[PDB]
Design a protein around this ligand. Structure first.
Ligand SMILES: CCCCCC(=O)SC
Lengths: 257, 253
């Protein structure tokens, strides 16, 4: 069962940029909907949204797209399969979505090579998982930012989909029906710069889980960083915008070149 | 367009013979139901709540069982866009009056000698429809309204305070799914039921309805219970069945 499709009302035009509505087709023939935002750069950053969300998400996608454009990067921003306006019959919460990222990268190199000499990625939640995987498996990606990445998908899924309070009964009963990948393996294969962000108030992903990833990856990656904040799930950029942009900005600056 | 719930039981599991029936509304919606002939000249229609269906095991199954034990025929259909019924949009009590009106006409047309008297029993949204029906459908001789949302906007906002306790992703899934003028037109027997523990409807709200309607209706009654939303029949099944049974016996003839 896919989550409801969420589509916002704003466009890159509201950010004072021209944009193209584009269609990206995956290795497995899913048609994705996205924006290509040309900023006159040779570098592109792809911001990846979270489960049940889309490219419009006002509390983190709008700010990060506006931040990326401000920083001067080009932006490719698309909806994951089964989300927003994108096709695909099923979301796989981080599994087949690697193909979504792969297709986005391929699309950049096929259509705008000179606008994507360097490609970076920023992921939130599910998108953060995909960022991690892409940073390992997709060679064209030079660096990645992973904000609130689910490390133990089983536990995180349980935290976000289950509700245990029996009273009132009408609520417990109404939601109960809805409550129906080895990420740590990637700590041995990622050798590129990776910026992990995790909030102390995050009820879906624990600090210790992300910290586990960091310390295991540190032994093969001198350029993995961990930032532990006081925000809840994917909301560091909402609660600590200037500091979020400062740290991620400096990180992109350094490795995007 | 909420999530269609369909249960695992039939009137066989109640030891009664039944037919699966198809009822078409005035605005051409195709409803699915059970017609359960009990050898009676009197029929009662139990009406389920929003996001539910005719199977709801905590109140529909017990009322249908109870009604058959009492000797009434039963027509029980899923409201539009619920259960197995047609229609794509639910209007949360608005156009659902037509579903009820369809059922009444279906009884009158196909089995009139089994529907010389027709009563309704509604739960939650279903109770609003029962109230509306008692006002607008002439062939309905009496009605039971268990936990009717009197102030719909207030009731929705209470629901919202609870949805906000949900984790983030679960909330995303259920987010889309988040009357006193009838007090002057209802002059037929009405049994109102409200629980003190109801988190969606206030006893005070149902009391306001009761007080206003009795200006024009000598046979409106109010039972205030110690139960949660539509669960008076679950928490106090004996007393619920005694009072409603007595109410029905008196007015169904
Ligand atoms: C929002 C769900 C309200 C349903 C109450 C029941 O227990 S069935 C009508």
């Amino acid at each position: 069962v896919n989550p409801p499709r969420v589509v916002g009302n704003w466009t890159p035009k509201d950010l004072s940029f021209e944009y193209k509505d584009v269609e990206i087709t995956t290795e497995d023939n899913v048609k994705l909907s996205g924006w290509w935002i040309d900023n006159g750069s040779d570098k592109t950053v792809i911001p990846l949204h979270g489960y049940t969300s889309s490219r419009w998400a006002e509390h983190y996608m709008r700010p990060v797209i506006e931040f990326l454009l401000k920083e001067g990067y080009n932006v490719l921003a698309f909806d994951f399969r089964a989300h927003g306006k994108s096709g695909g019959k099923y979301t796989t919460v981080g599994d087949k979505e690697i193909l979504d990222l792969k297709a986005g990268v391929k699309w950049l190199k096929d259509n705008y090579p000179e606008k994507s000499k360097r490609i970076g990625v920023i992921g939130f939640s599910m998108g953060a998982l995909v960022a991690i995987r892409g940073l390992s498996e997709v060679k064209e990606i030079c660096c990645g930012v992973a904000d609130s990445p689910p490390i133990y998908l089983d536990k995180t899924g349980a935290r976000g989909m289950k509700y245990f309070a029996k009273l009132p009964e009408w609520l417990y009963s109404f939601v109960k029906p809805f409550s129906e990948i080895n990420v740590l393996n990637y700590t041995n294969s990622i050798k590129k710069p990776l910026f992990l962000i995790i909030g102390r108030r995050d009820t879906l992903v624990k600090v210790e889980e992300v910290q586990e990833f960091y310390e295991r990856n540190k032994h093969v990656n001198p350029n993995v960083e961990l930032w532990v904040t006081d925000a809840p799930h994917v909301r560091t950029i909402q609660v600590f915008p200037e500091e979020w942009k400062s740290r991620v900005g400096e990180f992109l600056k350094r490795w995007m070149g």
